[PDB]
Amino acid sequence: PAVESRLVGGSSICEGTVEVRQGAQWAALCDSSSLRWEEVCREQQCGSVNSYRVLDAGDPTSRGLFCPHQKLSQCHELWERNSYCKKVFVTCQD
Secondary structure, three states: OOOEEEEEEOOOOOEEEEEEEOOOOOEEEOOOOHHHHHHHHHHOOOOOEEEEEEEOOOOOOOOEEEOOOOOHHHOOOOEEEOOOOOEEEEEEOO
16 A cells, blocks of 8 residues: 555645555654655645645654655655654645
8 A cells, every 4th residue: 555645734735734644544744855745745736845844843742654765655664653753834836
C-alpha cells in the first residue's frame, strides 16, 4: 500500500496541515526539501507548492507519523513519533 497524503484544515484542499496514511488511520506527518511538498500538492491535483511552515515545535503532546526518506512515494513503512512531532502546513497554488 502506498503512502497517501492530504492537506487538512485549510480553506481549500490545496492548503493545510499534512496528513498521511498507509494501511491506516490518518495521522499528521512529522518532518525535518521542497521536493516532498511538491509531490504532496500534486497528489491533491492542485498546483505547485507555494509555501510551508513548520508547526507545533516544542509541544510534547504533538504526535504523528514519520518517514525517514526524502520522498513519501519511497516509504515502505511509516514510523510513529508520539511526542514532539513537528507538523507541516503546506499551501499549494490552485
